[PDB]
Amino acid sequence: GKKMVVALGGNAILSNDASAHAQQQALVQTSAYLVHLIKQGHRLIVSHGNGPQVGNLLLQQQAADSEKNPAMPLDTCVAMTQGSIGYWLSNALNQELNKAGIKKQVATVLTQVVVDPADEAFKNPTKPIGPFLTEAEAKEAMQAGAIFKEDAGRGWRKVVPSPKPIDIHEAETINTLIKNDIITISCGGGGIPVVGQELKGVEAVIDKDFASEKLAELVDADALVILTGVDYVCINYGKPDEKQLTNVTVAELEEYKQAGHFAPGSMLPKIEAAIQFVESQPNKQAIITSLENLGSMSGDEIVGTVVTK
Amino acid sequence: GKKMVVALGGNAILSNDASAHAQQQALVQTSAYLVHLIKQGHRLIVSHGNGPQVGNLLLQQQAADSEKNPAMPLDTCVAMTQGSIGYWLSNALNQELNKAGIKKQVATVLTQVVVDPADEAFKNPTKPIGPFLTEAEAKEAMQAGAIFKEDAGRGWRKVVPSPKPIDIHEAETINTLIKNDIITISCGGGGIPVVGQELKGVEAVIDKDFASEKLAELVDADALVILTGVDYVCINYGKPDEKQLTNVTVAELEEYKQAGHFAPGSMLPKIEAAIQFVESQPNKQAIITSLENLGSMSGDEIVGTVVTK
């Protein structure tokens, strides 16, 4: 079967209700779609984000911060989310696989991702985490050196450095599990950020799609699946020349970018990740589509925007 | 080389300082000793407790509890500790392996441990977690239904259900990693407690030593190593008949236990875990000694209480 890396969205897992129960229930539905891919003969390699979750955990660190109960730094918080989310996801997957009568092991591996300490991201935090706050709440929280940015008509959120992944420490272990036909969950929340050969933890949160892209390269995956809310990457949305991109090449995508398409903060990064993967090695494809859309995939019918070349 | 399961104590990781760096630093020293075993050619299989850590995390969950940032249930908290402590230990091991010039991969696997939902532990919370409180503070901590118990001369701590492990969901995966010469860390904090084929999470904290004994059986380990603060299990401490057990058999221990030796909430359980492992399969050994002794082992020779039969 074809090896595909799929990165689940942290904001998809926690779309509203922040309770463990609500998130666990969401992953139950996510798992049905993923199992569907397993039934179509595909080999699953899973990862996930943690924006909402890590921001919330951080607030808990602060709520009781004291010498007797010290707040855990961001790198350890990411590690904790690899545990909570990895548990919820692996537990949900196992339940669905059992019901379906599919004998397949699922395993979550804590993952440390190496980044460049000179990364520009460290002096320009941009990844929003935690809950949306009012301007007043944002200013009050900035007194603690924290940096906040506003999302048009949504509120303010704490932003953190989001450096680029250059290597995955446990990559060889993940490969071994894949070779033994085990469904792996790794690079949780983008991966525990570390630098140097000593793997010193740094406070940041890596973007799941770029961590996944890097993972896909290291495990020699066949396809990288980047998730969105719709079925196809759409240009000129809501305009007479609206167009849903189906099968496209890298060249075509570059042409679209040069024409000003793809929002810089949402879609552009996804397009960039897709291009990077397709240009990494021969015979590689990137699929940008919805979770629901993958749950409809029949054999090779890969609905969604498929990038090649 | 022997397959040796070593269960690290959470109270040994977080002794006097609750900060992440202090625990990371404690794990570094611990790893120096573990790497020594690896140098002898043995195959290290690691596990660890989380009493202090999960209790502190639970307090943070409580401190910010609200509909927007709800406290995570105890099973999810255990999962989170598998992440934090797993991160610290795997990072520390890598460090000490690099120092010894030994190239081996380390991997932490999230572990769900099955327990009997009818276990008496669910109507009798007994495992102490978190910080020590004064009697007065304990009383204030018991206004919402929690249960705290006293440790003579040390203080009061919250106690939770601690059922017996009956299976490890990720056993086959952990064994596959062992077969691939990867140093594994699993059953973190005793394992995420679940029940039934559905693996329904339940609120409890499993004892690392019993979780390790079960793992040892499932991966057909050669030796189960239970850690204590001393070199030999000592009986009649400070008495004309004080004896330090070196090489004992199950029959002898049951005889001692019959006499009334071993403390109910410390040594007795360790003794029981050792017995269970030795009786589980032929040619198995259980070693009760200190971490320092492990770091002084030479080949198969080690200084501590060795149980066989």
XYZ file of C-alpha atoms in Angstrom:
618
model
C 0.000 0.000 0.000
C 0.927 3.655 -0.439
C 2.622 5.412 2.490
C 0.856 8.622 3.415
C 1.618 11.101 6.180
C -1.421 12.913 7.557
C -1.203 15.850 9.958
C -4.295 16.420 12.103
C -5.128 19.949 13.199
C -4.954 20.805 16.864
C -7.661 23.401 16.251
C -9.672 20.660 14.539
C -9.447 18.387 17.588
C -10.448 21.258 19.857
C -12.820 23.213 17.635
C -15.008 24.495 20.463
C -15.450 22.610 23.756
C -12.043 22.425 25.478
C -12.923 19.395 27.606
C -10.973 16.157 27.253
C -14.266 14.378 26.587
C -15.238 16.712 23.743
C -11.829 16.367 22.104
C -11.784 12.594 22.558
C -15.215 12.403 20.909
C -13.955 14.471 17.984
C -11.067 12.069 17.449
C -13.584 9.227 17.384
C -15.032 10.676 14.181
C -11.558 11.479 12.869
C -10.563 7.846 13.439
C -13.433 6.522 11.307
C -12.052 8.502 8.379
C -8.495 7.318 9.016
C -9.604 3.694 9.327
C -11.320 4.141 5.962
C -7.896 4.900 4.488
C -6.546 1.724 6.069
C -9.364 -0.246 4.421
C -8.425 1.207 1.036
C -5.021 -0.409 1.451
C -3.131 2.747 2.398
C -0.355 2.786 4.989
C -0.996 5.425 7.627
C 1.667 7.607 9.263
C 0.028 10.142 11.589
C 0.968 13.445 13.193
C -0.973 16.294 14.811
C -0.913 19.907 15.942
C -1.505 21.269 19.445
C -2.091 25.020 19.250
C -5.267 25.208 21.359
C -4.131 22.515 23.783
C -0.629 23.789 24.501
C -1.889 27.326 25.046
C -4.403 26.043 27.596
C -1.829 23.882 29.375
C 0.490 26.883 29.595
C -2.260 28.863 31.339
C -2.544 26.060 33.886
C 1.211 26.248 34.454
C 0.783 29.930 35.265
C -2.377 29.592 37.378
C -0.482 27.777 40.145
C 3.082 28.869 39.460
C 5.103 28.737 42.680
C 8.352 27.283 43.987
C 6.452 24.242 45.258
C 4.562 23.821 41.975
C 6.688 25.488 39.245
C 5.427 26.173 35.747
C 6.853 23.850 33.089
C 8.676 25.560 30.190
C 7.080 25.481 26.728
C 9.218 22.602 25.438
C 8.025 20.372 28.280
C 4.450 21.557 27.677
C 4.697 20.422 24.072
C 5.913 17.061 25.367
C 2.916 16.866 27.685
C 0.554 17.488 24.760
C 2.253 14.709 22.799
C 1.090 12.547 25.700
C -2.467 13.819 26.117
C -3.328 14.115 22.413
C -1.358 11.004 21.479
C -3.341 9.108 24.102
C -6.720 10.397 22.888
C -5.888 9.720 19.235
C -4.297 6.292 19.719
C -7.163 5.247 21.998
C -9.788 6.387 19.488
C -7.999 4.670 16.583
C -7.727 1.384 18.446
C -11.442 1.395 19.234
C -12.391 1.970 15.592
C -9.888 -0.613 14.325
C -11.232 -3.188 16.778
C -14.850 -2.599 15.777
C -13.841 -2.830 12.114
C -12.118 -6.124 12.861
C -8.766 -4.841 11.613
C -5.730 -6.212 13.441
C -3.331 -3.265 13.312
C -1.157 -1.906 16.105
C -1.078 1.821 16.854
C 1.818 3.461 18.689
C 2.628 7.017 19.761
C 6.286 7.946 20.023
C 7.488 11.045 21.835
C 9.354 13.095 19.253
C 12.098 15.700 19.587
C 12.513 17.890 16.512
C 15.770 19.730 15.900
C 15.602 23.359 14.802
C 18.139 26.073 14.009
C 18.750 28.331 17.037
C 19.455 31.210 14.635
C 16.005 30.782 13.068
C 14.334 34.132 12.378
C 11.225 32.772 14.098
C 12.873 33.265 17.494
C 12.815 37.041 17.106
C 9.445 37.071 15.377
C 6.861 34.867 17.186
C 3.893 34.135 14.936
C 2.110 30.916 15.912
C -1.076 31.638 17.880
C -1.818 29.275 20.773
C -4.365 29.209 23.585
C -7.775 30.966 23.784
C -8.888 34.164 22.056
C -8.722 37.182 24.352
C -10.088 40.727 24.270
C -7.729 43.634 23.648
C -7.842 44.494 27.358
C -6.974 40.939 28.409
C -4.184 40.900 25.819
C -2.577 44.093 27.169
C -2.843 42.819 30.732
C -1.034 39.628 29.703
C 1.666 41.456 27.735
C 2.982 42.840 31.020
C 4.498 39.384 31.475
C 6.666 39.836 28.397
C 4.198 37.687 26.459
C 3.473 38.773 22.885
C -0.061 38.808 21.467
C -1.492 39.310 17.987
C -5.065 39.862 16.833
C -7.100 37.814 14.371
C -9.671 39.878 12.453
C -12.943 39.704 14.370
C -11.812 36.753 16.477
C -9.751 38.301 19.249
C -6.154 38.262 20.451
C -3.989 35.193 20.995
C -0.550 34.611 22.486
C 2.040 33.993 19.763
C 5.229 31.969 20.087
C 8.312 31.306 17.925
C 7.627 28.732 15.222
C 11.042 27.709 13.780
C 11.549 25.361 10.841
C 12.270 21.678 11.540
C 15.668 20.538 10.245
C 15.741 17.026 11.711
C 13.653 14.491 13.637
C 15.620 12.736 16.386
C 13.489 9.588 16.602
C 13.155 9.353 12.795
C 14.929 5.982 12.720
C 12.598 4.571 15.365
C 9.513 5.791 13.510
C 10.864 4.158 10.342
C 11.306 0.839 12.132
C 7.720 0.913 13.374
C 6.458 1.715 9.864
C 8.530 -1.130 8.390
C 6.841 -3.426 10.900
C 3.446 -2.229 9.654
C 2.553 -0.301 12.781
C 0.436 2.841 12.532
C 2.561 5.536 14.111
C 1.658 8.840 15.709
C 4.697 11.108 15.968
C 5.922 14.692 15.782
C 2.998 15.505 18.045
C 2.303 19.219 18.220
C 5.044 19.776 15.659
C 7.601 18.037 17.872
C 9.453 18.887 21.087
C 11.739 21.769 19.927
C 15.446 21.148 20.559
C 18.744 22.551 19.222
C 22.266 21.224 18.763
C 23.577 17.685 19.094
C 22.883 17.953 22.824
C 19.202 18.449 21.979
C 18.692 21.375 24.342
C 15.039 22.267 24.610
C 13.907 25.693 23.456
C 10.556 27.409 23.929
C 8.671 27.293 20.648
C 5.899 25.462 18.822
C 6.641 24.028 15.386
C 4.024 23.995 12.614
C 2.585 20.477 12.183
C 2.538 20.662 8.379
C 6.234 21.469 8.148
C 7.094 18.872 10.775
C 4.985 16.388 8.789
C 6.650 17.400 5.523
C 10.035 16.718 7.090
C 8.756 13.438 8.534
C 7.437 12.399 5.131
C 10.900 12.968 3.649
C 12.776 11.040 6.352
C 10.466 8.014 6.219
C 10.353 8.124 2.426
C 6.552 8.449 2.358
C 4.695 8.308 -0.956
C 2.240 11.099 -0.192
C 1.952 14.010 2.216
C -1.607 14.894 3.185
C -2.199 18.448 4.389
C -5.694 19.120 5.752
C -8.036 22.048 5.115
C -11.710 22.751 5.755
C -12.871 22.274 2.172
C -12.526 19.600 -0.506
C -10.287 21.525 -2.915
C -7.854 24.425 -2.745
C -10.028 27.216 -4.125
C -8.901 30.387 -5.899
C -11.094 33.455 -6.461
C -13.530 32.151 -3.851
C -16.896 33.878 -4.167
C -15.999 35.464 -7.509
C -17.170 34.756 -11.093
C -13.785 33.188 -11.854
C -13.861 30.955 -8.787
C -11.894 27.771 -9.432
C -11.285 24.582 -7.484
C -7.808 23.194 -8.124
C -7.801 19.451 -8.749
C -4.688 17.895 -10.296
C -1.943 20.508 -10.449
C 1.822 20.603 -10.950
C 4.391 22.610 -8.998
C 4.888 24.928 -11.984
C 1.168 25.690 -12.077
C 1.187 26.422 -8.349
C 4.141 28.798 -8.686
C 2.230 30.541 -11.464
C -0.785 30.941 -9.177
C 1.403 32.313 -6.377
C 2.893 34.854 -8.767
C -0.664 35.896 -9.606
C -1.256 36.734 -5.949
C -3.250 33.646 -4.933
C -3.283 31.785 -1.590
C -3.700 33.751 1.647
C -0.228 34.310 3.250
C -1.259 33.141 6.715
C -3.423 30.121 5.958
C -3.296 28.597 2.484
C 0.113 29.824 1.278
C 1.979 27.838 3.976
C 0.087 24.685 2.974
C 0.938 25.242 -0.691
C 4.584 25.811 0.247
C 4.724 22.582 2.273
C 3.199 20.688 -0.651
C 5.732 22.092 -3.127
C 8.672 21.358 -0.823
C 7.607 17.713 -0.536
C 7.007 17.239 -4.260
C 10.408 18.749 -5.072
C 12.238 16.715 -2.417
C 12.379 13.480 -4.416
C 10.973 11.838 -7.567
C 7.515 10.245 -7.653
C 6.174 12.174 -4.657
C 2.686 13.673 -4.362
C 1.053 16.147 -1.990
C -2.673 16.077 -1.250
C -4.462 19.102 0.188
C -8.038 18.188 1.091
C -10.487 17.618 3.958
C -10.669 14.835 6.530
C -14.231 14.081 5.410
C -13.023 13.964 1.813
C -10.386 11.348 2.686
C -13.120 9.288 4.290
C -14.760 9.007 0.869
C -11.610 8.079 -1.030
C -12.170 4.849 -2.956
C -8.935 3.060 -3.795
C -6.976 5.625 -5.784
C -9.822 8.108 -6.164
C -7.935 10.866 -4.339
C -10.500 13.665 -4.266
C -8.895 16.974 -3.353
C -6.050 19.102 -4.682
C -3.294 16.751 -5.847
C 0.155 18.240 -6.396
C 2.786 16.477 -8.506
C 5.836 17.307 -10.644
C 22.925 -9.758 27.036
C 20.058 -10.030 29.496
C 16.769 -8.228 28.916
C 16.528 -6.155 32.110
C 13.440 -4.160 33.079
C 14.313 -1.247 35.393
C 11.589 0.780 37.122
C 12.679 4.298 38.095
C 10.986 6.000 41.017
C 9.053 9.216 40.509
C 10.020 10.283 44.024
C 13.666 9.754 43.068
C 13.244 11.961 40.000
C 11.516 14.736 41.919
C 13.138 14.637 45.343
C 13.660 18.125 46.802
C 13.172 20.498 43.855
C 9.959 20.374 41.788
C 11.350 22.334 38.818
C 11.726 20.761 35.379
C 15.492 21.402 35.319
C 16.040 19.723 38.688
C 14.182 16.639 37.487
C 16.025 16.668 34.161
C 19.321 16.929 36.064
C 18.328 14.061 38.352
C 17.583 11.919 35.294
C 20.995 12.716 33.830
C 22.762 11.221 36.850
C 20.360 8.282 36.727
C 21.138 7.745 33.050
C 24.873 7.589 33.766
C 24.114 4.482 35.820
C 21.743 2.992 33.234
C 24.253 3.486 30.410
C 26.705 1.484 32.507
C 24.357 -1.510 32.231
C 24.219 -0.959 28.474
C 28.034 -1.004 28.388
C 27.905 -4.499 29.896
C 25.967 -5.641 26.825
C 22.557 -5.885 28.508
C 19.334 -4.819 26.817
C 17.758 -2.046 28.853
C 13.967 -1.764 29.068
C 12.956 1.275 31.115
C 9.849 2.359 33.000
C 9.202 5.026 35.644
C 6.746 6.265 38.254
C 5.075 9.691 38.438
C 3.601 10.119 41.923
C 5.046 13.577 42.665
C 4.658 14.770 39.069
C 1.066 13.737 38.365
C -0.053 15.177 41.691
C 1.534 18.543 40.892
C -0.070 18.523 37.440
C -3.465 17.686 38.937
C -3.104 20.769 41.175
C -2.460 22.920 38.101
C -5.574 21.460 36.441
C -7.523 22.468 39.549
C -5.981 25.959 39.750
C -7.328 27.060 36.356
C -10.407 24.843 36.159
C -13.217 26.513 34.224
C -15.399 25.846 31.194
C -12.861 27.585 28.951
C -9.883 25.721 30.459
C -11.261 22.544 32.107
C -9.155 20.297 34.302
C -7.985 17.157 32.519
C -9.144 13.830 34.041
C -6.550 11.795 35.945
C -5.999 9.277 33.135
C -5.131 12.119 30.770
C -2.849 13.607 33.431
C -0.957 10.305 33.623
C -0.635 10.402 29.821
C 0.776 13.927 30.106
C 3.414 12.744 32.587
C 4.463 9.978 30.189
C 5.237 12.884 27.884
C 7.103 15.198 30.260
C 9.070 12.550 32.165
C 9.506 10.506 28.988
C 11.015 13.547 27.290
C 13.385 14.304 30.189
C 14.591 10.693 30.487
C 15.059 9.970 26.760
C 16.931 13.266 26.403
C 19.091 12.436 29.435
C 19.843 8.949 28.095
C 20.881 10.290 24.689
C 23.190 12.679 26.526
C 24.862 9.997 28.652
C 25.108 7.627 25.681
C 26.880 10.301 23.662
C 29.199 10.853 26.618
C 30.065 7.150 26.781
C 30.539 7.076 23.018
C 27.788 4.488 22.607
C 25.461 4.802 19.632
C 21.982 3.564 20.490
C 18.514 5.003 19.932
C 16.071 5.702 22.752
C 12.296 5.847 22.266
C 9.403 6.616 24.596
C 6.155 4.859 23.753
C 2.867 6.077 25.231
C 1.509 3.117 27.144
C -2.056 2.169 28.063
C -2.223 -0.446 30.814
C -5.361 -2.551 31.242
C -6.799 -3.078 34.719
C -9.834 -4.872 36.130
C -12.685 -2.361 36.587
C -13.851 -4.498 39.522
C -10.482 -4.052 41.231
C -10.933 -3.264 44.935
C -8.703 -0.216 44.405
C -11.667 1.633 42.923
C -13.381 1.773 46.325
C -10.150 2.203 48.271
C -7.758 4.938 47.009
C -4.266 4.256 48.383
C -1.475 5.682 46.207
C -0.049 8.999 47.473
C 0.682 11.641 44.844
C 1.678 15.290 44.858
C 3.190 17.426 47.663
C 3.097 16.777 51.395
C 0.630 18.913 53.343
C 0.102 19.621 57.031
C -2.940 18.072 58.695
C -4.700 21.433 58.507
C -3.953 21.935 54.806
C -5.058 18.359 54.158
C -8.404 19.050 55.821
C -8.854 22.054 53.541
C -7.936 19.867 50.567
C -10.601 17.350 51.596
C -13.592 19.693 51.418
C -14.470 18.766 47.833
C -14.371 14.989 48.267
C -10.656 14.259 47.907
C -8.927 11.830 50.277
C -5.574 12.526 51.941
C -3.603 10.148 54.130
C -0.654 10.660 56.443
C 2.916 9.414 56.152
C 4.402 9.390 59.668
C 6.793 12.305 60.090
C 6.461 13.391 56.460
C 2.955 14.808 56.153
C -0.313 14.222 54.314
C -0.773 13.477 50.609
C -3.685 12.889 48.248
C -4.347 9.193 47.551
C -5.921 7.694 44.429
C -7.106 4.273 43.220
C -4.147 2.076 42.341
C -5.494 -1.085 40.626
C -3.340 -4.000 39.489
C -2.181 -4.135 35.857
C -3.433 -7.169 33.917
C -2.215 -6.301 30.419
C -0.184 -3.767 28.436
C -1.783 -2.688 25.169
C 1.467 -1.701 23.452
C 3.325 -4.873 24.513
C 3.892 -6.160 20.980
C 5.145 -2.770 19.795
C 7.554 -2.451 22.730
C 8.861 -5.948 21.987
C 9.353 -5.073 18.341
C 11.454 -2.091 19.414
C 13.466 -4.287 21.791
C 14.049 -6.762 18.937
C 15.457 -3.812 17.004
C 17.983 -2.858 19.692
C 16.132 0.319 20.616
C 16.185 1.371 24.278
C 12.531 1.639 25.240
C 10.778 3.731 27.861
C 7.191 2.586 28.428
C 4.512 2.134 31.085
C 5.334 5.679 32.114
C 3.825 6.549 35.474
C 2.516 3.008 35.773
C 0.707 3.304 32.451
C -2.455 5.131 31.337
C -5.218 3.147 33.165
C -7.914 1.716 30.875
C -10.514 -1.065 31.142
C -12.131 -3.508 28.720
C -11.415 -4.300 25.079
C -12.578 -0.748 24.345
C -9.747 0.497 26.581
C -11.959 2.937 28.482
C -9.860 5.380 30.473
C -10.395 5.390 34.225
C -9.086 7.681 36.943
C -6.265 5.939 38.776
C -2.482 5.756 39.109
C -0.879 2.330 38.755
C 2.211 1.307 40.718
C 5.313 1.347 38.478
C 6.755 -1.784 40.090
C 3.698 -3.881 39.279
C 3.402 -2.301 35.840
C 7.076 -3.187 35.262
C 6.574 -6.754 36.490
C 3.777 -7.142 33.936
C 5.887 -5.613 31.156
C 8.725 -7.931 32.140
C 6.415 -10.934 31.678
C 5.052 -9.705 28.348
C 8.480 -9.034 26.802
C 9.860 -12.204 28.417
C 12.572 -10.244 30.223
C 15.344 -12.079 32.069
C 15.493 -9.781 35.072
C 13.157 -7.346 36.797
C 15.008 -4.624 38.686
C 13.177 -2.906 41.541
C 14.887 0.143 43.021
C 15.273 1.088 46.674
C 17.435 3.551 48.577
C 19.707 0.827 49.934
C 21.903 -1.993 48.626
C 20.212 -4.980 50.250
C 16.720 -5.586 51.582
C 17.317 -5.334 55.328
C 15.290 -6.990 58.093
C 15.465 -6.098 61.799
C 17.255 -2.809 61.140
C 19.164 -1.859 64.275
C 18.707 -5.196 66.030
C 21.035 -8.032 67.166
C 19.318 -10.135 64.498
C 19.561 -7.536 61.725
C 20.180 -9.309 58.427
C 20.704 -8.049 54.886
C 19.257 -10.502 52.377
C 21.556 -11.249 49.452
C 20.389 -14.321 47.538
C 16.926 -15.506 48.545
C 14.224 -17.791 47.167
C 10.480 -17.193 47.022
C 9.971 -19.771 49.789
C 12.315 -17.873 52.099
C 10.664 -14.500 51.479
C 7.193 -15.926 52.133
C 8.673 -17.301 55.340
C 10.030 -13.870 56.312
C 6.785 -12.202 55.279
C 5.061 -14.756 57.505
C 7.193 -13.542 60.418
C 5.980 -10.012 59.746
C 8.901 -8.357 57.957
C 8.790 -5.700 55.224
C 6.802 -2.461 55.555
C 3.212 -2.591 54.165
C 3.537 0.647 52.208
C 7.070 0.368 50.833
C 9.040 -2.883 50.923
C 6.188 -5.390 51.034
C 4.876 -4.406 47.557
C 8.382 -4.549 46.085
C 8.803 -7.986 47.643
C 5.466 -9.074 46.177
C 6.332 -7.770 42.715
C 9.612 -9.706 42.833
C 7.831 -12.920 43.850
C 5.220 -12.586 41.126
C 7.914 -12.245 38.454
C 10.040 -15.172 39.623
C 7.013 -17.488 39.776
C 5.738 -16.278 36.378
C 8.280 -18.199 34.306
C 11.274 -20.508 34.810
C 14.779 -19.018 34.935
C 13.686 -15.505 35.868
C 15.340 -13.260 38.445
C 14.258 -10.186 40.382
C 16.813 -7.763 41.779
C 16.046 -5.301 44.560
C 18.904 -2.836 44.929
C 19.916 0.806 44.545
C 20.506 2.705 41.320
C 24.096 3.329 42.409
C 24.727 -0.415 42.614
C 23.464 -0.798 39.053
C 26.070 1.721 37.970
C 28.701 -0.482 39.609
C 27.660 -3.777 38.018
C 30.296 -5.831 36.186
C 28.936 -8.219 33.579
C 26.157 -10.135 35.334
C 27.473 -9.457 38.843
C 25.492 -6.897 40.850
C 25.279 -5.931 44.525
C 21.722 -6.235 45.810
C 18.991 -8.628 46.923
C 18.524 -11.260 44.213
C 15.316 -13.293 44.193
C 15.009 -16.607 42.337
C 13.465 -20.083 42.836
